[PDB]
């Protein structure tokens, strides 16, 4: 089918360099939007970088911008990220994904691997989401609220995420639901102001949500609401 294969990482010293790899099969298009995530331990997803175009611009989050080379081969379909000057900080599960042409969004992921370290005068988009954690019961409806910085129309994506295992995006577009994705999930709202309906809650559900916007780089993820028992 359509996957992407992550490989690379492990355990490395300050100062010291590594390369992930990604190779894409089962591609329908040319040169994709790419990227990199990553996730601190008890932190929240973060974004790395970003490659676009045929001529492979890219883009970098403050944190790496000088350390940190993201490029790719879109002859042998493969993604790579060369970490340079490793600092603790960079201590994370690293995903690379891909933006899909039927919702617009980043819906492909690797598995992840854990790395261990022993202009135009545009605007950055923030998103607050709300609340930070909640306790409920299966059959409970819970809604979780984004507030992005800027008016950003219906260009708001909603992921679960569990524990070690990549992001998987639930909603598109603010309101469309994701393919094989069941139907208790739901979205609303548009500009500055967004909601994620769960209507009837089960036990697969318990998880960590996060709002995130495609569109406008640098791309961002909100904070995450982490609904628990």
């Known amino acids: 089918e359509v996957q992407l294969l992550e490989s690379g990482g492990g355990l490395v010293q300050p100062g010291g360099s590594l390369r992930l790899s990604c190779a894409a099969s089962?591609?329908?298009?040319?040169?994709?939007?790419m990227g990199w995530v990553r996730q601190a331990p008890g932190k929240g997803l973060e974004w790395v970088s970003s490659?676009?175009?045929?001529?492979?611009?890219?883009y970098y989050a403050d944190s790496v911008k000088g350390r940190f080379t993201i490029s790719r081969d879109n002859s042998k379909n493969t993604l790579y990220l060369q970490m340079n000057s490793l600092r603790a900080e960079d201590t994370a599960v690293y995903y690379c994904?891909?933006?899909?042409?039927?919702?617009?969004?980043?819906?492909?992921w690797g598995q992840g691997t854990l790395v261990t370290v022993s202009g135009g005068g545009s605007t950055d988009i923030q998103m607050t989401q709300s609340p930070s954690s909640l306790s409920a019961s299966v059959g409970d409806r819970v809604t979780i609220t984004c507030r992005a910085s800027?008016?950003?129309?219906?260009?708001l994506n909603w992921y679960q995420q569990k524990p070690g295992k990549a992001p998987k995006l639930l909603i598109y577009?603010?309101?469309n639901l994701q393919s094989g994705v069941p139907s208790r999930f739901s979205g609303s709202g548009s500009g500055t102001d967004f909601t994620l309906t769960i209507s009837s809650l089960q036990p697969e559900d318990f998880a960590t949500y996060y709002c995130?916007?495609?569109?406008?780089?640098?791309?961002?993820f909100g904070q995450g609401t982490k609904v628990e028992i």
């Open positions: 089962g591609f329908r298009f040319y040169a994709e939007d």
């Open positions: 994904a891909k933006r899909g042409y039927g919702s617009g969004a980043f819906d492909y």
């Open positions: 490659i676009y175009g045929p001529s492979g611009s890219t």
């Open positions: 800027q008016s950003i129309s219906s260009y």
């Open positions: 577009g603010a309101s």
């Open positions: 995130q916007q495609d569109s406008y780089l640098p791309y961002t």
